[PDB]
Paper text:
We were able to obtain diffracting crystals in the presence of five structurally diverse compounds transported by [name]: monovalent planar aromatic harmane (3.8 Å), divalent planar aromatic methyl viologen (3.1 Å), quaternary phosphoniums tetraphenylphosphonium (TPP+; 3.4 Å) and methyltriphenylphosphonium (MeTPP+; 3.2 Å), and quaternary ammonium benzyltrimethylammonium (3.9 Å). Although the crystallization conditions varied for each substrate, the TPP+-, MeTPP+-, benzyltrimethylammonium-, and harmane-bound proteins crystallized in the same unit cell as proton-bound EmrE3, with one copy of the EmrE3/[name] complex in the asymmetric unit. For all substrate-bound structures, the maps show positive densities between the substrate-binding E14 residues, including a four-lobed density for TPP+, a three-lobed density for MeTPP+, and oblong densities for the harmane and the methyl viologen structures. The harmane- and benzyltrimethylammonium-bound structure was excluded from this analysis because, at 3.8–3.9 Å resolution, we were not as confident about interpreting subtle changes in sidechain orientation. For the Me-TPP+, harmane, and benzyltrimethylammonium-bound structures (pH 6.5, 7.1, and 7.25, respectively), the contribution of a substrate+ proton-bound population cannot be ruled out. However, the positioning of each of these substrates centered close to the midpoint between the E14 carboxylate groups, similar to TPP+, implies that in the major component of the population, both glutamates bear a negative charge. Like a pair of calipers, the E14EmrE sidechains can move farther apart to accommodate large substrates such as quaternary ammoniums, or closer together for flat, aromatic substrates or substrates with small headgroups, like harmane and methyl viologen or singly substituted guanidinyl compounds. Although all the substrates in the present EmrE3 structures were contained within the aqueous pocket, we similarly observe rotameric rearrangements of the TM2 sidechains in different structures, including Y40EmrE and F44EmrE (equivalent to Gdx-Clo’s M39Clo and F43Clo) in the harmane and methyl viologen structures.
Numbering used by the authors:
A (entry chain C): 3 to 92
B (entry chain A): 2 to 104
C (entry chain B): 2 to 81, 84 to 103
D (entry chain D): 4 to 92
Write the structure that this text describes.
């Protein structure tokens, strides 16, 4: 009973990833989601960018081919639920 | 007719204020957009009263019916959060507001 | 703590409406950008001071202190039906007995 | 009053870089609109707007040799008539 939910990678590309989610219903529906993506090894910080809360998709570009990444989608506050994190290799 | 645009101006802010209690710091979509819509409509209808009716009369009517409505829409939607000395303090604040506007 | 940013939001709204009178129909850039900022801050300061103070309580205090600060700023350095400052002190009296 | 002093700085057969004295610190407007068209009138005119803080604007996509009439309007006309000039590329 938390949000968001069902973080999946729709389209893939050696230099870009298209992801989505099924957040929830109208009573949850927030104003902005912040999404973080970085390398799986962990020898660097983590990139971040926000997106309005009426959209459920997000396009990430400028990725390196062959490397495994970790993608996480957050909420404005930790009250809506624990964030969802996934992995994907380009 | 023009003494009704104020009645729509107060109520629109009444809803926008209680919806602000649901906005969760403007972090929740739908209550965040709701207060903006209601405040925009109240401005536009007040923009039609500031021609026929004056200032203090149209404002004291707002402050009177508004404080009597958004306070009543505070128990029906949750009950209470905190209470302190007197409700009569609110009554004499309104009495203090009324003796500088009308008088 | 609910009173500092309630009164600070009353200043932002007062400055917002007085500056709306200075600028024209949002045409003069510097004053119009100013008015936009203080009503955006007031909307965010009132929303944050509403979770503690009941809805009807913060209504009168703002309306009172506002016109108190409006009429205080009016006679302050702008222009000058004044029965007396008895009405200002009457707003002060009620704001006190709802306060801490 | 505003705008004031409309003149063309740089001039290329197919472009005109115009400028103006918008005003002084606090009396800036929010936007100006620029109207450049043929000095005759065989066709309508072209028009664009520029933010209030900017004091220059480039006009591209012109025909060489034709004389144009460039006019800059304030947001309203309650602070001065719009200044209009002429130039031949
Ligand atoms: C907090 C508060 N109390 C009384 C009146 C108003 C208010 N906020 C406003 C915003 C726009 C117009 C009127 C009000």
């Amino acid at each position: 009973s938390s949000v968001p939910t069902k973080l999946e990678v729709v389209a893939a590309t050696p230099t870009s990833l298209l992801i989505s989610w099924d957040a929830g219903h109208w009573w949850e529906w927030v104003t902005y989601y912040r999404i973080t993506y970085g390398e799986t090894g962990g020898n660097s910080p983590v990139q971040e960018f926000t997106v309005p809360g009426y959209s459920s998709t997000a396009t990430i570009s400028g990725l390196k081919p062959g490397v495994d990444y970790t993608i996480t989608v957050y909420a404005p506050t930790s009250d809506y639920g624990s964030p969802i994190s996934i992995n994907y290799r380009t | 007719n023009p003494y009704i645009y104020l009645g729509g101006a107060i109520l629109a802010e009444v809803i926008g204020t209680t919806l602000m209690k649901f906005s969760n710091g403007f972090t929740r979509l739908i209550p965040s957009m709701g207060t903006i819509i209601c405040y925009c409509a109240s401005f536009w209808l007040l923009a039609q009263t500031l021609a026929y009716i004056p200032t203090g009369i149209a404002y004291a009517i707002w402050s009177g019916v508004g404080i009597v409505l958004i306070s009543l829409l505070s128990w029906g939607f949750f009950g209470q959060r905190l209470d302190l000395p007197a409700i009569i303090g609110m009554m004499l604040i309104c009495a203090g507001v009324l003796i500088i506007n009308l008088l």
